[PDB]
Short mmCIF file of C-alpha atoms and ligand atoms in Angstrom, two decimals:
data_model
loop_
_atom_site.label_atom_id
_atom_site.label_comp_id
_atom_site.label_asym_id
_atom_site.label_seq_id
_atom_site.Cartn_x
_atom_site.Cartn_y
_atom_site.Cartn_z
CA UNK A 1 98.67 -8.90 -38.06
CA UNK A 2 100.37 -12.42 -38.01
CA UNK A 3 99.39 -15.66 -39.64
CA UNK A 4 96.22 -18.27 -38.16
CA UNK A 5 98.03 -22.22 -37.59
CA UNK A 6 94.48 -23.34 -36.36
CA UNK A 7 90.74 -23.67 -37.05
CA UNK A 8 87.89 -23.33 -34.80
CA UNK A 9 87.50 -27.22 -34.38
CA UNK A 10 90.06 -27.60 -32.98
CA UNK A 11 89.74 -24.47 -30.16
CA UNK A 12 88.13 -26.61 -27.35
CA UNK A 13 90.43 -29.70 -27.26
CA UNK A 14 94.04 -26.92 -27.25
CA UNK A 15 92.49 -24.77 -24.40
CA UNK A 16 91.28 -27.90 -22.28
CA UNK A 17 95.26 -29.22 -22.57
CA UNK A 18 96.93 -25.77 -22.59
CA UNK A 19 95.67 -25.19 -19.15
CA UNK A 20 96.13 -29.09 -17.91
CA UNK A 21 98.34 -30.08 -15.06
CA UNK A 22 98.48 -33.39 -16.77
CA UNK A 23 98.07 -33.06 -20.77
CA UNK A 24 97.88 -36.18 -22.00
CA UNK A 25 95.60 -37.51 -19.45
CA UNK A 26 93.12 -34.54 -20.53
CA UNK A 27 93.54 -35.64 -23.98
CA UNK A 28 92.41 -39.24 -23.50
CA UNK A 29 89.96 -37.56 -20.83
CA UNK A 30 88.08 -35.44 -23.45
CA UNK A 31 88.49 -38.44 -26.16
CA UNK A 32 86.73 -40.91 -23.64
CA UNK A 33 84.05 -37.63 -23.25
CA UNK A 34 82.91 -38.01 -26.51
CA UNK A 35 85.66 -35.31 -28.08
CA UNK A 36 86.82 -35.07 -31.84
CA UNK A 37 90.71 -35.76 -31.86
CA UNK A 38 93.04 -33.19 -33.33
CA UNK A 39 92.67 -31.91 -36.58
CA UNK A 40 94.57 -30.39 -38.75
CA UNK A 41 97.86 -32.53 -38.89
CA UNK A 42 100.70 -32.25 -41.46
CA UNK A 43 99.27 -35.53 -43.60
CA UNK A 44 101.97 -36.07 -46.35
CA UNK A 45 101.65 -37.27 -49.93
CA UNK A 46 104.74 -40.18 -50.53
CA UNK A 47 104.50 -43.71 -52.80
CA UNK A 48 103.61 -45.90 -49.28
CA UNK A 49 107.31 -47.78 -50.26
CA UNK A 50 109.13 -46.76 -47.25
CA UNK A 51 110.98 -48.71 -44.17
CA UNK A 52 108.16 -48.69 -41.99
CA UNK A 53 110.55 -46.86 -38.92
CA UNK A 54 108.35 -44.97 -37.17
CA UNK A 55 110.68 -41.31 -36.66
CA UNK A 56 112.54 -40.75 -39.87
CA UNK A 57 114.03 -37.84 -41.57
CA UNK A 58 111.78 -38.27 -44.63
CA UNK A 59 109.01 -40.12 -44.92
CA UNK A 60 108.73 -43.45 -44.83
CA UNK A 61 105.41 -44.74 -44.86
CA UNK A 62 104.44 -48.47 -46.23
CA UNK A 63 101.39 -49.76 -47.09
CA UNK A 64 100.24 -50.04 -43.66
CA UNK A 65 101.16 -46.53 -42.93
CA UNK A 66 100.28 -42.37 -43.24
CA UNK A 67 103.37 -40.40 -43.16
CA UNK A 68 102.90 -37.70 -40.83
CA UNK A 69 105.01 -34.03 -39.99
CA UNK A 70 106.28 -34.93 -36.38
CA UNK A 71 105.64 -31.75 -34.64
CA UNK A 72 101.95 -32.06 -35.82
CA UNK A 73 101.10 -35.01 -34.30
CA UNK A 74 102.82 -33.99 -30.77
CA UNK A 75 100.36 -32.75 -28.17
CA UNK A 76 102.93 -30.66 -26.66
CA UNK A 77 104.62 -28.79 -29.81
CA UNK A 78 100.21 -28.53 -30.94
CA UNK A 79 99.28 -26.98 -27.13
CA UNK A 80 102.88 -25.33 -27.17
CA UNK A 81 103.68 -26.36 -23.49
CA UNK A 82 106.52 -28.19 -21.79
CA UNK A 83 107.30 -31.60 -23.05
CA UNK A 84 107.96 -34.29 -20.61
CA UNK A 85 111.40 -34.81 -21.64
CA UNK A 86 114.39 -33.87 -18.24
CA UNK A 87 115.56 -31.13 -21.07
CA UNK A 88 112.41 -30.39 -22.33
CA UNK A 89 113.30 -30.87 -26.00
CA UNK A 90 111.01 -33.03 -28.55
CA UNK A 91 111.22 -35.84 -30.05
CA UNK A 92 108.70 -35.77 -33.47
CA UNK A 93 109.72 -32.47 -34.29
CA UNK A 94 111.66 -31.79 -37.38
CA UNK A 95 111.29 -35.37 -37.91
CA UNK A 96 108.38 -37.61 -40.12
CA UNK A 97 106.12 -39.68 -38.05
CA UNK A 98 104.72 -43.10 -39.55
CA UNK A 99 101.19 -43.87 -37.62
CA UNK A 100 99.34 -47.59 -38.76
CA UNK A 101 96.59 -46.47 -41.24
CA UNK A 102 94.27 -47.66 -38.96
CA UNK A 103 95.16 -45.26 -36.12
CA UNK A 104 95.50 -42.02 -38.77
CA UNK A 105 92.01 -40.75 -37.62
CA UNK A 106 94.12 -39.67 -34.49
CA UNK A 107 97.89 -39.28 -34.74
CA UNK A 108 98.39 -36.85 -31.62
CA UNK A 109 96.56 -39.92 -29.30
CA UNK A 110 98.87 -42.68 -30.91
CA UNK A 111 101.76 -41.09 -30.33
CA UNK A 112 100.70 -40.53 -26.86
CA UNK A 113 99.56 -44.06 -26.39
CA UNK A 114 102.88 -45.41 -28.41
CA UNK A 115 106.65 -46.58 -27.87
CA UNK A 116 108.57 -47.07 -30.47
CA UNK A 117 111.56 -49.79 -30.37
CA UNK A 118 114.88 -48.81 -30.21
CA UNK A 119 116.41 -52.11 -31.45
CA UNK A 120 114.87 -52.41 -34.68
CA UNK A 121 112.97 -48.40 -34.69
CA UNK A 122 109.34 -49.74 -35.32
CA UNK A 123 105.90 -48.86 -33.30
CA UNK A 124 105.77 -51.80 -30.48
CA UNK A 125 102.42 -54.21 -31.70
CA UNK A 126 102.58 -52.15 -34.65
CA UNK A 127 105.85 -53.62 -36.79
CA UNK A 128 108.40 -54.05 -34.27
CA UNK A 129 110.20 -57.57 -34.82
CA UNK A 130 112.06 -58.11 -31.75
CA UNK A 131 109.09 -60.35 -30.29
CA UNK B 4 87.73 -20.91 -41.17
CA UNK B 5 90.32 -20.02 -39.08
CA UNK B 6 91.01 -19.00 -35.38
CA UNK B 7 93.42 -16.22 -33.57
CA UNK B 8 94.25 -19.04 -30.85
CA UNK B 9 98.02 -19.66 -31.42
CA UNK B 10 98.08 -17.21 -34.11
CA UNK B 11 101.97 -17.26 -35.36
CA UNK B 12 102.92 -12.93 -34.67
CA UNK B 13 106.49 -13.84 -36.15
CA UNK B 14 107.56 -10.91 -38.88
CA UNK B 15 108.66 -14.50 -41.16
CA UNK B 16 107.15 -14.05 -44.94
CA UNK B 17 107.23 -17.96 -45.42
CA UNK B 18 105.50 -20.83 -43.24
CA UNK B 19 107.19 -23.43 -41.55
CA UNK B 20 108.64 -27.00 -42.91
CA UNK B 21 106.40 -30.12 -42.97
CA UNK B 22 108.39 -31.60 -40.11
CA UNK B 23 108.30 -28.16 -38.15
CA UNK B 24 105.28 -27.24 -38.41
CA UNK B 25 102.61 -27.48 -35.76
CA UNK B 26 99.57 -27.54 -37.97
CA UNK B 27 99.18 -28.10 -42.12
CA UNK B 28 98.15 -24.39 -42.23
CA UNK B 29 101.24 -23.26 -40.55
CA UNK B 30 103.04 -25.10 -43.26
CA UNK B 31 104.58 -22.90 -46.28
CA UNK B 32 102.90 -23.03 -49.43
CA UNK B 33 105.75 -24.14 -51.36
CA UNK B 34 104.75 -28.08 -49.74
CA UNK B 35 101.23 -27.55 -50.56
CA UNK B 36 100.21 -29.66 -52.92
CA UNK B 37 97.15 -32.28 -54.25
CA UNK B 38 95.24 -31.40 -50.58
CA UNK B 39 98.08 -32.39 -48.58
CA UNK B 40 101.81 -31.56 -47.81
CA UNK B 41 105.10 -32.87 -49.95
CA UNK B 42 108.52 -33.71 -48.49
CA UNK B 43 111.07 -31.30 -51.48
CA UNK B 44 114.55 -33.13 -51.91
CA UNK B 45 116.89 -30.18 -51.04
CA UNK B 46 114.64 -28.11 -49.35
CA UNK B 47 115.65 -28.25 -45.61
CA UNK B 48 114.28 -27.57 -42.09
CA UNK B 49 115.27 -24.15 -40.59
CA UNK B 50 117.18 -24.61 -37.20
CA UNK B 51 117.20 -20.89 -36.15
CA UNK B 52 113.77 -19.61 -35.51
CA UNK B 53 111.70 -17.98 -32.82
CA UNK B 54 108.50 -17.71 -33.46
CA UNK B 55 105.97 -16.04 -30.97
CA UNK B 56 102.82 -17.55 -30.83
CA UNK B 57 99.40 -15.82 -29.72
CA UNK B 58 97.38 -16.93 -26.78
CA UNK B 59 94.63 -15.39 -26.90
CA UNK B 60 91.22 -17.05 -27.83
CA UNK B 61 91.02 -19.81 -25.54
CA UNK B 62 87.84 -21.66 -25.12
CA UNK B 63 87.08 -23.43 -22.23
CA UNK B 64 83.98 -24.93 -23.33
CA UNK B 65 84.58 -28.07 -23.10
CA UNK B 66 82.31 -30.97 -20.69
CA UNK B 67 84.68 -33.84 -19.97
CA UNK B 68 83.32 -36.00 -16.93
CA UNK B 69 85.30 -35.28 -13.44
CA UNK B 70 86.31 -31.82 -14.76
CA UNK B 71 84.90 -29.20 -12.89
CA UNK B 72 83.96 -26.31 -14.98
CA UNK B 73 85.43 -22.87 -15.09
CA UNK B 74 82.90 -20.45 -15.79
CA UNK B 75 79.89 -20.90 -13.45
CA UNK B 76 76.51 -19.44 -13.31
CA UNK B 77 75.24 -16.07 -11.77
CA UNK B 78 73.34 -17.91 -8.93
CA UNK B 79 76.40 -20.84 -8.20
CA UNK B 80 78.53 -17.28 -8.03
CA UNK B 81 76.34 -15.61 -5.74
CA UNK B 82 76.31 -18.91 -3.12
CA UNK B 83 80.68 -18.37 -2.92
CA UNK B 84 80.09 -15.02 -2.53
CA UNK B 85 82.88 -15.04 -0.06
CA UNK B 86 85.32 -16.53 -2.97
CA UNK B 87 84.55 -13.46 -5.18
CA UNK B 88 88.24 -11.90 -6.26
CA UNK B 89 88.09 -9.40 -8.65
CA UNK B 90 90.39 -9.93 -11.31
CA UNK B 91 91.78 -7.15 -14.42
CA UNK B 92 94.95 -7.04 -16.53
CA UNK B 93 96.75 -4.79 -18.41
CA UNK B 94 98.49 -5.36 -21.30
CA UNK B 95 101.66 -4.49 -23.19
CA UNK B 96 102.06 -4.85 -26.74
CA UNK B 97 104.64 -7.58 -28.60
CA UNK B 98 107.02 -5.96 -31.10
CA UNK B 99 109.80 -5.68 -32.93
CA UNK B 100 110.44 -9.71 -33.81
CA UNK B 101 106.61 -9.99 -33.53
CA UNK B 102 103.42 -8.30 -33.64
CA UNK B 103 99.66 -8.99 -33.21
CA UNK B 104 99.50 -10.44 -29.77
CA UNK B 105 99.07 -9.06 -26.03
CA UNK B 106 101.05 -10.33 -22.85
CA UNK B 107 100.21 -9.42 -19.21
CA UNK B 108 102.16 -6.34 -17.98
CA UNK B 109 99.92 -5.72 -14.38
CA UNK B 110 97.81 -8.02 -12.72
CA UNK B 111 95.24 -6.22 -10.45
CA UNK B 112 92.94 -7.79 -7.66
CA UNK B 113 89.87 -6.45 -5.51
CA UNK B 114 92.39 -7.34 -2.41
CA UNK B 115 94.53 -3.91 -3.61
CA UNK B 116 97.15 -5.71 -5.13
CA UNK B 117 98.46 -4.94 -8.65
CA UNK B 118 101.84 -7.05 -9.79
CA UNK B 119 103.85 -5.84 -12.34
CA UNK B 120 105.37 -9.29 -15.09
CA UNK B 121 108.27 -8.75 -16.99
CA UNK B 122 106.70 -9.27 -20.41
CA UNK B 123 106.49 -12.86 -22.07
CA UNK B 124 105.39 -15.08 -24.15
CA UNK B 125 105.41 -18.43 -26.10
CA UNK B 126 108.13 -18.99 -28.31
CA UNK B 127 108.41 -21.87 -30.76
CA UNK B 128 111.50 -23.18 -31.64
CA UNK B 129 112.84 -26.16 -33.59
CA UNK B 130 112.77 -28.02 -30.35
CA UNK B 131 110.15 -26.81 -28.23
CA UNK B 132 108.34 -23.52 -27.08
CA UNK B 133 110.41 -21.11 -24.84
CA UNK B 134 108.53 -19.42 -22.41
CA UNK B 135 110.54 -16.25 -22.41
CA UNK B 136 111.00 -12.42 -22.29
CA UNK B 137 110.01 -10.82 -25.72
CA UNK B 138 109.91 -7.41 -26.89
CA UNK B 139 106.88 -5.37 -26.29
CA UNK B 140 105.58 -1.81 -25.22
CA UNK B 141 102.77 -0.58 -23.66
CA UNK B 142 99.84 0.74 -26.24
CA UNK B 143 100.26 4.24 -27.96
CA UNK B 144 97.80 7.41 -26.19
CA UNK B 145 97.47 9.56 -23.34
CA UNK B 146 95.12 6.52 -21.12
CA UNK B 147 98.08 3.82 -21.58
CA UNK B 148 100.92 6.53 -20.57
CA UNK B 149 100.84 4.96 -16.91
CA UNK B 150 102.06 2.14 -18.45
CA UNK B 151 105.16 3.19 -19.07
CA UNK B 152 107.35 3.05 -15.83
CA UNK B 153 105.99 -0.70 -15.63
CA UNK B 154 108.08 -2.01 -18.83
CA UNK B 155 111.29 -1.81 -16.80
CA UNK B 156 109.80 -2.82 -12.94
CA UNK B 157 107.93 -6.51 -13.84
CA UNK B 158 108.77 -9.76 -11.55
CA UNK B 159 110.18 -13.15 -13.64
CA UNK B 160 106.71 -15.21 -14.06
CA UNK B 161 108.30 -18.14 -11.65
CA UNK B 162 108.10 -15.01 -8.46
CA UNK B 163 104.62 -13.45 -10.10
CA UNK B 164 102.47 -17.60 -9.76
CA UNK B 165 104.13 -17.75 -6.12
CA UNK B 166 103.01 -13.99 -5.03
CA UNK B 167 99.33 -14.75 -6.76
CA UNK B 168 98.96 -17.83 -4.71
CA UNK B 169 100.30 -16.81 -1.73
CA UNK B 170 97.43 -13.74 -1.79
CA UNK B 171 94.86 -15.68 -3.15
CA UNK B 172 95.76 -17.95 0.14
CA UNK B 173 95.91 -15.39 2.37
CA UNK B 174 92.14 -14.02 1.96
CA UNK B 175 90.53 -17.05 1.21
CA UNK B 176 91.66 -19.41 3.53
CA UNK B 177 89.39 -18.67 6.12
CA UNK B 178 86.74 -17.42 3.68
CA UNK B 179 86.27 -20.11 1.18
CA UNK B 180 86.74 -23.49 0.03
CA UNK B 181 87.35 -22.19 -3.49
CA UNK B 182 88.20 -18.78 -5.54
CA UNK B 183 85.68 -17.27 -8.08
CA UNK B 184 87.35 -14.94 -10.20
CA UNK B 185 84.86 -11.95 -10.81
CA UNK B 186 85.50 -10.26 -14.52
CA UNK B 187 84.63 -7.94 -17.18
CA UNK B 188 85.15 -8.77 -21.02
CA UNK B 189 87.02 -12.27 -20.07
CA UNK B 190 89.11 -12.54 -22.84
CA UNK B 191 92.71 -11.01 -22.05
CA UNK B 192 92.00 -11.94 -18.18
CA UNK B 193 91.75 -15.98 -19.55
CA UNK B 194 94.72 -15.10 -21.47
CA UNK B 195 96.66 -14.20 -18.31
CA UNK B 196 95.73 -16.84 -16.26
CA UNK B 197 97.47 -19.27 -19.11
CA UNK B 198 100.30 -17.80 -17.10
CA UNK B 199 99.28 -19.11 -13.40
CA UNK B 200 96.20 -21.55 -13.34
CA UNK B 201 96.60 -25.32 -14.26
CA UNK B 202 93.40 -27.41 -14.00
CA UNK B 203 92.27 -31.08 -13.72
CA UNK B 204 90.08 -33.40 -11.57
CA UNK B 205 88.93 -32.22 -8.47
CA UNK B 206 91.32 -33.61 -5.85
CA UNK B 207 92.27 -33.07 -2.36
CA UNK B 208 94.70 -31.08 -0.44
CA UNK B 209 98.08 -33.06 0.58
CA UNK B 210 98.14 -32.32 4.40
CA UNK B 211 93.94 -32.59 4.68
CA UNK B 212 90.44 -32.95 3.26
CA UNK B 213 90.01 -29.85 1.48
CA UNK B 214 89.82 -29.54 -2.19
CA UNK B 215 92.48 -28.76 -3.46
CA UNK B 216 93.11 -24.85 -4.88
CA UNK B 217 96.85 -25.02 -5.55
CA UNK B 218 99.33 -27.20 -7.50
CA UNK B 219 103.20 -27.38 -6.95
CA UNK B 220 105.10 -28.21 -10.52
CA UNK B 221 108.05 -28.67 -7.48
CA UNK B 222 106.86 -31.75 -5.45
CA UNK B 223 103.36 -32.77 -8.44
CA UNK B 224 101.17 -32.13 -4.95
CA UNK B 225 97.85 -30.27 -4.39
CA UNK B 226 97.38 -27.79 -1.64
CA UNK B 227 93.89 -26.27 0.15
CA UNK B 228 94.36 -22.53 0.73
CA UNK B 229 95.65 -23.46 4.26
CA UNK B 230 99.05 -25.63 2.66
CA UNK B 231 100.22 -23.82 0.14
CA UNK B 232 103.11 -21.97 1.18
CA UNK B 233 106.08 -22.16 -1.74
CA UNK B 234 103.07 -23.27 -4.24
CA UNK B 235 103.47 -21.91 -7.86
CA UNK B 236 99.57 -22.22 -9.51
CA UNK B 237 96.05 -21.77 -9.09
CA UNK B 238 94.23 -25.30 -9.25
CA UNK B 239 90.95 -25.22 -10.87
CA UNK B 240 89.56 -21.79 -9.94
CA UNK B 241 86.26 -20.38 -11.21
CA UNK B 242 85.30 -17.48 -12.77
CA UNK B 243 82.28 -15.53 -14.12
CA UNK B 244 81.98 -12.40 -16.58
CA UNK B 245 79.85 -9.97 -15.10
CA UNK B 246 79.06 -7.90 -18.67
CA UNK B 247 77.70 -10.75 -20.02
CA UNK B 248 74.79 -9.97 -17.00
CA UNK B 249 72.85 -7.41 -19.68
CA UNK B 250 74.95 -4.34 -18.98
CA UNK B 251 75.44 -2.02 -21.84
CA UNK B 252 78.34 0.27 -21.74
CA UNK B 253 81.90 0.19 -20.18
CA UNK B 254 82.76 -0.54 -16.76
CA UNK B 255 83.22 2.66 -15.09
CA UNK B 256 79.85 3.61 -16.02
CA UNK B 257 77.46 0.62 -14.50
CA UNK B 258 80.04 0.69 -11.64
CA UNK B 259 79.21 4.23 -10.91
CA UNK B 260 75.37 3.47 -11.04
CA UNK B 261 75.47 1.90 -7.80
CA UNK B 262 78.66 2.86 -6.11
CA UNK B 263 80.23 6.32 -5.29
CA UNK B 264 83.46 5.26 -3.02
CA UNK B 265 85.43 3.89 -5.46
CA UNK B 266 86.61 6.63 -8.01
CA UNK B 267 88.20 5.48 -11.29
CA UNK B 268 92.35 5.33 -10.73
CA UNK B 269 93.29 3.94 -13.97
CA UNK B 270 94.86 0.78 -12.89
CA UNK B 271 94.23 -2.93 -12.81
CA UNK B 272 93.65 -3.45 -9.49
CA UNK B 273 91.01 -0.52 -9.41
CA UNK B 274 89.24 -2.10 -12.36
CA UNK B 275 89.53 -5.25 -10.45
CA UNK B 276 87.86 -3.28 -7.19
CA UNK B 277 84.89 -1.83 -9.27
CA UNK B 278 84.43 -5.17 -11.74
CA UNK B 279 83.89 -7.53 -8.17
CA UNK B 280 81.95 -3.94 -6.19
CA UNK B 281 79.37 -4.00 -9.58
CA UNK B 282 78.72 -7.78 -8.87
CA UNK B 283 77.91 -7.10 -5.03
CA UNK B 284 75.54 -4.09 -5.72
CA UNK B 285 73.81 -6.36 -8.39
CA UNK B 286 73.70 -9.58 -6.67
CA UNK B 287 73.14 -8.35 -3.12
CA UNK B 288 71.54 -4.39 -3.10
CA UNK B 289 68.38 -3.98 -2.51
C1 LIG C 1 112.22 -44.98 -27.38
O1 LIG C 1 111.15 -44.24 -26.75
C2 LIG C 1 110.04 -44.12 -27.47
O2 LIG C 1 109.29 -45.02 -27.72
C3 LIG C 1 109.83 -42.73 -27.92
N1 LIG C 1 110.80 -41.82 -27.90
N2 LIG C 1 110.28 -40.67 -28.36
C4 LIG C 1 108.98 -40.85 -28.66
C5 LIG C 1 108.68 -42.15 -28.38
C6 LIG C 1 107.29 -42.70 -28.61
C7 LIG C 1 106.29 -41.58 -28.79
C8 LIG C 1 106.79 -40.51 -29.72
C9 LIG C 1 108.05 -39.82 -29.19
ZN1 LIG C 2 106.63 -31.88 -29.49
ZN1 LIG C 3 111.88 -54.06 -32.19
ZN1 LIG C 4 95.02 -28.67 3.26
ZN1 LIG C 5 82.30 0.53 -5.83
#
């Protein structure tokens, strides 16, 4: 009974962070171990002529970009545990999530790595022109 | 190839929205398209669920450098002898608004303890997952009926952590450095402990040199077995699964090849008593 969201590859990486006191830490811990980053994202199809923003409604990708589903590139909505938030609430989910092509290989560690501007709503050294 | 870890019990026919979703397999086939997913015009997010999500099927295989790990070896079990707690759980079924998953109904230990959890689980919402009190029932037959009394007598999860450390504390602290968590058929028992054990880098106590054994999500501080009064979690316990030592049939019946004085009461913290009495008769009899 019920339906499977994930695949065995995957298995190792959610239990070591389900269990974590600090989740992102163990993320970048079992990267810098030699660990395969999340699989299994929401990767969409679009024409690569969006704005660039990096959280938008739909997606928004340019031709630096992957548009992403936002709750599949957060470790906390993929480990389903508390997000670090004072009301506990996310921020990708139900939104898109625009990650630099050359960081797509792992969009749950950019997004934990990331800040995105609130002045002009692009990734910081990836798009954002306010320096 | 898929797994049951995080398996989605919700009774929902259709999958989740691109944006929603956790995973591109938990996305409805309607966005499915040319080996990826498709943002419809006019097709819109759904702002009312609760999904529960399943966890069991953890794995914690993993070897990432200043992680101690969890599972240890016959002979590093036998030298923390003194850290042996044996550890069982019983189980009440989800239902109703979801089905194919089981959450911890009474925890039992070798110490004589058994506590009784009012039954929860992992929700997913549109903005998070709710840790929260679902539906559920014990399982159907004559073995389970015991069960029964216990769906309306379980502790909030906050008061279960606190009791668990607090015992744990109180028997090991001048005992052992450490707690080794002595089971049989691991599975549901690694489930539970989802529900009180966090784990990290080894680290030190707050008031001394000990390793740490506890974590407070109050103050973000580590406590030895000697500081951790008002502490909510297990920090970095170990544990080993005696029927993966060659035994053959259930419990009760290897148990009984060595021991006589503990006769089979039907409840967790007697499983607990003959799963951690097993281990001493193999590792230290004759
Ligand atoms: C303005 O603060 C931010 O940069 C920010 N706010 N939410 C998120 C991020 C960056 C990471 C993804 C989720
Ligand atoms: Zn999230
Ligand atoms: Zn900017
Ligand atoms: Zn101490
Ligand atoms: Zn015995």
């Amino acid at each position: 009974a019920g339906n499977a969201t994930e695949v065995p590859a995957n298995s190792t990486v959610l239990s070591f962070c389900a269990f974590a006191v600090d989740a992102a830490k163990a993320y970048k811990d079992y990267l810098a171990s030699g660990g395969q980053p999340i699989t299994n994202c929401v990767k969409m199809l679009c024409t690569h002529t969006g704005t660039g923003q990096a959280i938008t409604v739909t997606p928004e990708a340019n031709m630096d970009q992957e548009s992403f589903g936002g709750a599949s590139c957060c470790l906390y909505c993929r480990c389903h545990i508390d997000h670090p938030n004072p009301k506990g609430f996310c921020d990708l989910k139900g939104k898109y999530v625009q990650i630099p092509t050359t960081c797509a290989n792992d969009p749950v560690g950019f997004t934990l790595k990331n800040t995105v501007c609130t002045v002009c709503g692009m990734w910081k050294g990836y798009g954002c022109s306010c320096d | 190839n898929v797994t049951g870890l995080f398996k989605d019990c919700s009774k929902v026919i259709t999958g989740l929205h691109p944006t929603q979703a956790p995973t591109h397999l938990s996305v409805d086939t309607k966005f499915k398209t040319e080996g990826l997913c498709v943002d419809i015009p006019g097709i819109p997010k759904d702002m009312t669920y609760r999904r529960l999500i399943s966890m069991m099927g953890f794995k914690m295989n993993y070897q990432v450098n200043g992680y101690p790990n969890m599972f240890i070896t016959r002979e590093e079990a036998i030298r923390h002898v003194r850290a042996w707690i044996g550890f069982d759980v019983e189980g009440c079924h989800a239902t109703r608004e979801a089905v194919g998953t089981n959450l911890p109904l009474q925890l039992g230990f070798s110490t004589g303890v058994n506590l009784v959890a009012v039954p929860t689980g992992y929700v997913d919402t549109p903005n998070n997952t709710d840790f929260s009190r679902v539906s559920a029932k014990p399982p159907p037959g004559d073995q389970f009926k015991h069960l029964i009394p216990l769906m309306y007598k379980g502790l909030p999860w906050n008061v279960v952590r606190i009791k668990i450390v607090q015992m744990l504390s109180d028997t090991l602290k001048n005992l052992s450095d450490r707690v080794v968590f002595v089971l049989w058929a691991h599975g549901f028992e690694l489930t539970s402990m989802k529900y009180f054990v966090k784990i990290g880098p080894e680290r030190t106590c707050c008031l001394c040199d000990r390793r740490a054994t506890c974590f407070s999500t109050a103050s973000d501080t580590y406590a030895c077995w000697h500081h951790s009064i008002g502490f909510d979690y297990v920090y970095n316990p170990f544990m080993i699964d005696v029927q993966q030592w060659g035994f053959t049939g259930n419990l009760q019946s290897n148990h009984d090849l060595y021991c006589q004085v503990h006769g089979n009461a039907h409840v967790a913290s007697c499983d607990a008593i003959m799963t951690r009495c097993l281990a001493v008769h193999e590792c230290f009899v004759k």
